[PDB]
Amino acid sequence: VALSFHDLHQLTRAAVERAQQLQVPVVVSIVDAHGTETVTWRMPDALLVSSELAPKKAWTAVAMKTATHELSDVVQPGAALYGLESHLQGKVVTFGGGYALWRDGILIGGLGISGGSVEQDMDIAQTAIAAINVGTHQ
Amino acid sequence: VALSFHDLHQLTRAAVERAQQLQVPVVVSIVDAHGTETVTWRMPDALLVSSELAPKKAWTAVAMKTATHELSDVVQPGAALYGLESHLQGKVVTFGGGYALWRDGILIGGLGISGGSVEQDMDIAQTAIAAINVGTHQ
Amino acid sequence: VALSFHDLHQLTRAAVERAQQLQVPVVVSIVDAHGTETVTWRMPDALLVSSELAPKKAWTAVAMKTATHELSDVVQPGAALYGLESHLQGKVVTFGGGYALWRDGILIGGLGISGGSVEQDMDIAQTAIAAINVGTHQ
Amino acid sequence: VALSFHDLHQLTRAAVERAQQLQVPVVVSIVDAHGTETVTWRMPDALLVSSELAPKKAWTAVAMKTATHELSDVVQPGAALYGLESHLQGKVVTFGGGYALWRDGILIGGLGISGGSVEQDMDIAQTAIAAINVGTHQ
Amino acid sequence: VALSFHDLHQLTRAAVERAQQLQVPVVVSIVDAHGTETVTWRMPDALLVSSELAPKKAWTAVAMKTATHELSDVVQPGAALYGLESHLQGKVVTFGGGYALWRDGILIGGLGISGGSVEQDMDIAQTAIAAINVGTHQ
Amino acid sequence: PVALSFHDLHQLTRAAVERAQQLQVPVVVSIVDAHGTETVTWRMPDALLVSSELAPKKAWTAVAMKTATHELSDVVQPGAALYGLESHLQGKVVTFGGGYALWRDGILIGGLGISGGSVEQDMDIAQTAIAAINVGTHQ
Amino acid sequence: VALSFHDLHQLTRAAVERAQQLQVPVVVSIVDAHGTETVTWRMPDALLVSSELAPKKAWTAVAMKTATHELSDVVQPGAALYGLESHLQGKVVTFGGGYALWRDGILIGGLGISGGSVEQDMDIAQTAIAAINVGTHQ
Amino acid sequence: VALSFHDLHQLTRAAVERAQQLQVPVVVSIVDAHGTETVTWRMPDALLVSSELAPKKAWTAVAMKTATHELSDVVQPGAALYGLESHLQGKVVTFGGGYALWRDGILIGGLGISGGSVEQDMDIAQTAIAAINVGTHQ
Ligand code: HEM
Ligand code: HEM
Ligand code: HEM
Ligand code: HEM
Ligand SMILES: [Cl-]
Ligand SMILES: [Cl-]
Ligand SMILES: [Mg+2]
Ligand code: NA
Ligand code: NA
Ligand code: NA
Ligand code: NA
Ligand code: NA
Ligand code: NA
Ligand code: NA
Ligand code: NA
Ligand code: NA
């Protein structure tokens, strides 16, 4: 059930291809179900911050079993998990671009994209994920 | 006056059993009156973030002599301790799930639960604390 | 011009005496004009967090040539230095209890109190400062 | 295209000269297109916090290809990159004083000023940048 | 194959019992096959350092697939992995008391003991491991 | 003209993984550019957890010191010129083998780092991968 | 059983007085039995490193229940706890100047001095300890 | 008694000029008597490590009141300050290239050079120091 070589290779290829179509250089990061960095690819000229944000988005997706855009409302002032980003010492990113990857009810990894607008990062991520046979929810 | 073996054992057992009833895997953490990690137990499949949040809640409860849900208002924009989570470099958690433990007016420890919704974490924590009948306020 | 032995000893004594009158245990911290820790004194049962907050308040006062309560408005959402506490990795504290210490137009140090309410910490600090011949503004 | 000795020297001198005119001591920092510290200069009595803020402003400008005052709106509560300063563990500063430096469509570095009001920092930075043959936008 | 509740409970009980027989208080730590803290138990008056060293020994065992005493020679001056403890920022401990736990050729976790002499820690760890049906090599 | 291309990165990464498969040792492969930025990472199943940190560090060291990492082993020993270096740089530099600096036409273009086997295996894997593309390991 | 006001005061005074006699400026640090910083005093012109070394020496004494000079042999290459200083991320200091304080078989705190030679730090620490009624071994 | 503008400028220029004569690109760093970074200059293509080592050598010179080559013997296995580089969490560098700057018996700052061989760094640093009216010992 885990991510196979083919899964990893296709996710990464499809993300890079979609980023090229959008004309935005990104960092692509994939983590396994335990949060271990498994693939990283940086396109030329990607924003330097993206080297830290993409793997953090992928990690966040696994570590909270969620897509990172789904955390945006819950960390606001007044919301249930206000302060989370400081409580976890910057390890969680709470804007879009990270998705949890599921197969047959089992969490198999996380994908993180950074380098565009949040909308671009999410488009790239969703396009990549559509290239392989996986879900973004259990 | 201090947490005995029986206190630590029953707090842990009761927390895990309540979490089983709720069908949510959590990390349980107990710290002593000086904030030293005394017991940690991770249920299978608990959110990875919970491994950091539960001990931090337990620590926060002792370090601020308060339940963590009682810090939620006082760290908001405009409130007296705005910014506290950054000032203490992520050591304090300001949402529910941590309680201070008191016996005969003496602070004896802190219990932290993380892995569910905030309300679940607080339910589990309160249940565990009710199993040994210590107080949560001086 | 600098804090003398007598300055340091009287500041510390007066802060502790005032805390005793208020019946709240605090940490007292004094830093020099360069931000080096010079005196620390912890009263029994002071909040654990105060061991970190009091020196940070003192340091903040010198590092920003201000009282720490004067930073509260400027770090709010919408205000000029929003985010400051993260930018400086938790070294600055932006609620009351730290004061800059000045003599003959020269910055000689900083005093930080933590362990009570913000208002108690500011009272203690102001009382201590009144015990020696120094100002809180240039 | 890169920053020459002359570019660095003129930037630094013009910044210091403008700060002297404003009668505010600042830290001046210049990073290259990869974010490596290239020049630092501290004026006597500059706020201690400026030693950390000015290089961070310069680094931010390259790392996000933006002037730092342009990030102020996008990190607010409710905005698209809320929490960014914690996600990047304090490496990015999101109030004014940092500018990205461009020549012939190529990013050649970043300039950061800290020590005055945000407006003084920006005036100093803009004055310095006007002393050499560069743009602040691609 | 993984560590069951019974495995974890017996390891912990047996380590504590052995420590009691030796009259030395220890910290017991167990990590899973991915290095995630699963159980921590601190006996009263265990050396404060043991709170950091026991989990690090358990983690090292899984992270290097080795008992920690088997790393002592290989990190010495002149040996193949000299400097390893600094390369990994203190995450690995290279003296005895940590053991990797294997069942049917599969790595299922790590156990770490700290609080005694290295020889006591190893005794305690070996005694605990003998209480369950597992090997210390693949 | 001489930077690492897509093809360079791809071939380095593939050849490293292929060689690690031949040796039957799972590794982490890391490539950094001439400025030390992480460019590629690839982790093989069951690689030592430590190798997730050690491989990118090796690659970064190679560029940050313009050297192969095995060439630092003597110089950081007790009594040698750069004793303590690993602590001075807060663990960012690794001083045993497996990292190589990558050069073309006298220009530094990147760094490759391998971790997960013995130090010898990591070097073998790195050298094999480097041979798949025609760059040099010295200026 | 604990360090009283009189104990803390006399330790600190006696350490400063001795350091004055020797004409070496030091930092004095005292921690309680849980390792919490209780007193710090810095003499003018004390080595900057001493602001970190002295509290660490005091902490190490309690955390390891030993004098710090007693750790020097055991951390050497080839000895049982080689690497310890990196394993504990610099929290332990292994050269002289820190002493564990005992009364009636109970560990009550730790004293740390830094700023002279190791031998001066030890002379100062020992002179200070001799000013109160305590032992340096259980 | 302090480093003037001219002192800072001349030190920096002379260091860069000597590095050019040796044909090695270095990072030059100057700190004041309190260890605050005052000047940094990076020559093109200086080793990336030098960006961290040169300011650390300058800081070390002031923080230990010594040239950094004078620390080499004292931090060896078997010597009085073995482990120091870890105790201070990498803030001190114990090989040559850093010098303390003294005028009329007063410590006024530190100069640090990194990028060459240790001998080249020391040559550069000594040459720069010779360009102004200061000593390297009290
Ligand atoms: C921060 C790093 C700096 C470095 C490395 C530096 C380096 C130098 C060097 C190498 C020269 C000689 C140029 C030549 O080769 O002929 C020079 C000249 C000079 N620098 Fe600087 N400088 C620095 C900053 C400044 C600053 C901040 C000022 C004034 C605010 C200043 C004022 C001058 C003056 C007046 C000259 C003489 C010629 C001229 O007016 O342009 N320099 N500097
Ligand atoms: C540290 C030393 C520990 C000791 C000495 C210990 C001892 C025991 C004993 C004597 C029992 C009674 C049942 C029997 O006859 O086997 C027991 C039950 C139990 N303990 Fe512990 N325990 C320890 C730690 C833990 C921890 C950390 C947990 C975490 C949840 C735990 C969970 C339980 C549970 C759930 C039971 C009752 C259910 C069952 O045994 O199947 N114990 N323990
Ligand atoms: C890590 C990031 C990787 C990316 C972005 C990536 C991307 C690609 C792309 C774009 C192609 C088609 C290129 C072409 O031939 O025209 C390709 C082909 C291929 N890749 Fe990868 N790849 C990666 C890693 C790997 C690894 C680690 C392996 C093997 C261990 C691998 C094996 C292959 C093979 C066997 C082919 C087809 C053979 C051929 O090109 O004729 N790739 N990859
Ligand atoms: C660091 C925290 C210190 C605190 C909180 C403190 C507090 C006090 C207090 C409350 C007294 C009155 C004692 C009594 O008679 O009951 C006192 C007296 C004294 N202290 Fe301290 N003290 C401190 C440090 C020092 C140091 C470092 C020295 C000398 C190096 C010192 C020298 C004295 C002397 C000589 C007296 C007797 C003269 C007088 O009453 O002013 N103290 N201190
Ligand atoms: Cl915030
Ligand atoms: Cl070492
Ligand atoms: Mg049950
Ligand atoms: Na926050
Ligand atoms: Na905050
Ligand atoms: Na009971
Ligand atoms: Na913030
Ligand atoms: Na934030
Ligand atoms: Na080391
Ligand atoms: Na070292
Ligand atoms: Na070490
Ligand atoms: Na060391």
Asked if D102 contacts D114 with a C-beta cutoff of 8 angstroms, the reply is no
**Under DSSP, is residue F8 helix (H, G, I), strand (E, B) or coil?**
helix
Count of CB atoms within 10 A of residue H101's CB? 25
Q: Enumerate residues 6+ apart whose C-beta is below 8 A from F37.
A: A42, A48, A51, D34
CA distance F90 to chain H (A): 5
Tell the residue nearest (CA) to atom 13 of ligand 3. Answer: F7
Helix, strand and coil percent figures for chain B, each rounded to 5: 40, 20, 40
What is the crossing angle of helices G118-130 and G5-22, to 10°? 140
Supply the CATH number for residue C44's domain.
3.30.450.150
Alpha-carbon distance of C113 to D64, in angstroms, equals: 38
**Under DSSP, is residue B28 helix (H, G, I), strand (E, B) or coil?**
strand
Query: What does DSSP say about strands H98-103 and G106-114: parallel, antiparallel, or unpaired?
Result: unpaired
Q: How far is CA C54 from the centre of its chain?
A: 6
Tell me, in angstroms, the distance from the centre of ligand 15 to residue E94's CA: 10
Nearest to D121, CA basis, from D68, D79, D59: D68
- H or E stretch covering F128: helix F119-131
Nearest to E8, CA basis, from E120, E108, E135, E96: E108
Residue A85 in tokens: 């980003």
Q: Where are the alpha helices (DSSP H) in chain B?
A: 5-22, 50-63, 84-87, 118-130
**Main-chain phi, psi angles of F73, to 5 degrees:** -60, -45
Handedness of CA G43, G49, G52, G57 (dihedral sign): negative
Alpha-carbon distance of D46 to D27, in angstroms, equals: 7
Which residue of E28, E38, E56, E59 to mutate against B (max B Cβ within 10 Å)?
A: E38
Count of CB atoms within 10 A of residue G67's CB? 23
Q: Which atom, in ligand 4's list, is nearest to the CA of G12? A: 27
Alpha-carbon distance of C42 to C19, in angstroms, equals: 11
Question: Do the chains contact at D80 and A118, CB–CB below 8 Å?
Answer: yes
Kindly write down the DSSP assignment for every residue of G41-74, as one continuous string. Answer: EE-TT--TTHHHHHHHHHHHHHHTTS-GGGGTGG
Using CA coordinates, name the residue in chain A closest to B96: A80
**Main-chain phi, psi angles of B127, to 5 degrees:** -60, -45
Alpha-carbon distance of C93 to C57, in angstroms, equals: 6
Nearest to E11, CA basis, from E101, E85, E77: E101
Asked if H89 contacts H61 with a C-beta cutoff of 8 angstroms, the reply is no
Residue D86 in tokens: 């914690």
Nearest to B99, CA basis, from B53, B62, B50: B62
Residue A38 in tokens: 């498994």
F99-104: strand order across its sheet: A98-103, A106-114, A27-32, A37-42, F38-43, F28-33, F107-115, F99-104
Q: Which atom, in ligand 4's list, is nearest to the CA of C39? A: 1
Q: Which atom, in ligand 4's list, is nearest to the CA of C12? A: 5
**Smallest Cβ distance to E38: which of B36, B38, B42?**
B42
- Chain F residues contacting E, CB < 8 Å? 48-50, 53-54, 57, 73, 76-78, 86-87, 90-91, 93-96, 118-119
Nearest to F35, CA basis, from F133, F127, F135, F102: F102
Cβ contacts of D36 on chain F, cutoff 8 Å:
35
Nearest to A126, CA basis, from A45, A4, A22: A22
| Annotated resolution, angstroms | 2.0
- Pocket of ligand 3 contains residue A103 by CB under 6 Å: no
Beta bridge partners of D113: D28
Alpha-carbon distance of F101 to F86, in angstroms, equals: 18
Alpha-carbon distance of G82 to E41, in angstroms, equals: 25
H97: left (phi over 0), alpha (psi -120 to 50) or beta: left
Question: 């308040």: which residue's tokens?
Answer: C57
Handedness of CA H91, H117, H50, D27 (dihedral sign): positive
Q: Which chains touch H (3 or more CB pairs under 8 A)?
A: C, D, F, G
Q: How far is CA F5 from the centre of its chain?
A: 17
Q: Per residue, what are the HEC states of G21-49?
A: HHCCCCEEEEEECCCCEEEEEECCCCCCC
Q: Where are the alpha helices (DSSP H) in chain H?
A: 5-22, 50-64, 84-87, 118-130
Q: Which of B5, B8, B13 to mutate to test the pocket of ligand 2 (most atoms within 8 A of CB)?
A: B13
How would you class A133 by CB atoms within 10 Å of its CB: exposed for 0-12, middle for 13-18, buried for 19 or more?
Answer: exposed
- Pocket of ligand 2 contains residue B16 by CB under 6 Å: yes
CA distance C112 to chain G (A): 14
Cβ contacts of E40 on chain B, cutoff 8 Å:
37, 39-40
Kindly write down the DSSP assignment for every residue of C63-130, as one continuous string. Answer: HTTS-GGGGTTTTSTTSTTTTHHHHTTT----SSSEEEEEETTEEEEEEEEESS-HHHHHHHHHHHHH
CA distance G5 to chain H (A): 30
Residue C69 in tokens: 């309560």
**Under DSSP, is residue A98 helix (H, G, I), strand (E, B) or coil?**
strand
**Main-chain phi, psi angles of E32, to 5 degrees:** -85, -175
Tell me, in angstroms, the distance from the centre of ligand 7 to residue B9's CA: 14
* Number of domains into which chain F is organized: 1
How would you class G57 by CB atoms within 10 Å of its CB: exposed for 0-12, middle for 13-18, buried for 19 or more?
Answer: buried
Asked if G63 contacts G109 with a C-beta cutoff of 8 angstroms, the reply is no
The yes-or-no reply on E/G contact (3 CB pairs or more, < 8 Å) is yes
Kindly write down the DSSP assignment for every residue of H93-111, as one continuous string. Answer: --SSSEEEEEETTEEEEEE
Alpha-carbon distance of G137 to G107, in angstroms, equals: 9
Count of CB atoms within 10 A of residue H133's CB? 8
Residue B118 in tokens: 């905030």
Q: Enumerate residues 6+ apart whose C-beta is below 8 A from C14.
A: C127, C128, C130, C131, C132
What is the length of chain A?
A: 138
Q: Enumerate residues 6+ apart whose C-beta is below 8 A from E124.
A: E15, E18, E19, E22, E24, E26, E97, E113, E116
Tell me, in angstroms, the distance from the centre of ligand 5 to residue A96's CA: 18
Residue B52 in tokens: 């950091």
Beta bridge partners of B32: B109
Q: Enumerate residues 6+ apart whose C-beta is below 8 A from B96.
A: B67, B68, B69, B72, B118, B119, B121, B122
Tell me, in angstroms, the distance from the centre of ligand 16 to residue G83's CA: 7
Asked if H54 contacts H29 with a C-beta cutoff of 8 angstroms, the reply is yes
What is the crossing angle of helices E5-22 and E118-130, to 10°? 140
CA distances from E27 to E44, E70, H84 (A): 9, 21, 28
Which residue of B41, B43, B52, B53 to mutate against E (max E Cβ within 10 Å)?
A: B41
Helix, strand and coil percent figures for chain A, each rounded to 5: 40, 20, 40
What is the length of chain D?
A: 138
Alpha-carbon distance of C67 to C60, in angstroms, equals: 8
Rg (CA), chain C: 14
Counting ligands in written order, the one closest to the CA of G5 is 4
Cβ contacts of A77 on chain D, cutoff 8 Å:
77
Pairs across C and G, CB distance < 8 A: 28
Q: Where are the alpha helices (DSSP H) in chain E?
A: 5-22, 50-64, 84-87, 118-130
> In this structure, which amino acid lies at residue D95?
F
Q: Enumerate residues 6+ apart whose C-beta is below 8 A from G92.
A: E49, G56, G59, G60, G63, G64, G71, G84, G85, H87
**Smallest Cβ distance to G77: which of E53, E56, E76?**
E76
Residue H71 in tokens: 């620390």
Q: Which chains touch A (3 or more CB pairs under 8 A)?
A: B, D, E, F
Q: Per residue, what are the HEC states of B60-77?
A: HHHHCCCCHHHHCCCCCC
Alpha-carbon distance of H25 to F9, in angstroms, equals: 29
Question: Do the chains contact at G40 and C40, CB–CB below 8 Å?
Answer: yes
H98-103: strand order across its sheet: D98-103, D106-114, D27-32, D37-42, H37-42, H27-32, H106-114, H98-103
Alpha-carbon distance of E61 to D137, in angstroms, equals: 52
Alpha-carbon distance of D132 to D6, in angstroms, equals: 9
Residue A91 is part of which domain span?
A: 1-138
Kindly write down the DSSP assignment for every residue of H1-19, as one continuous string. Answer: ----HHHHHHHHHHHHHHH
- Chain H residues contacting D, CB < 8 Å? 36-42, 44, 48, 51
Tell the residue nearest (CA) to atom 31 of ligand 4. Answer: G13
Alpha-carbon distance of G125 to G100, in angstroms, equals: 11
- Chain E residues contacting G, CB < 8 Å? 47-49, 52-53, 56, 72, 75-77, 85-86, 89-90, 92-95, 117-118
Beta bridge partners of A98: A112
Alpha-carbon distance of F137 to F130, in angstroms, equals: 8
Q: Which DSSP symbol is given to G76?
A: S
Alpha-carbon distance of H31 to H110, in angstroms, equals: 5
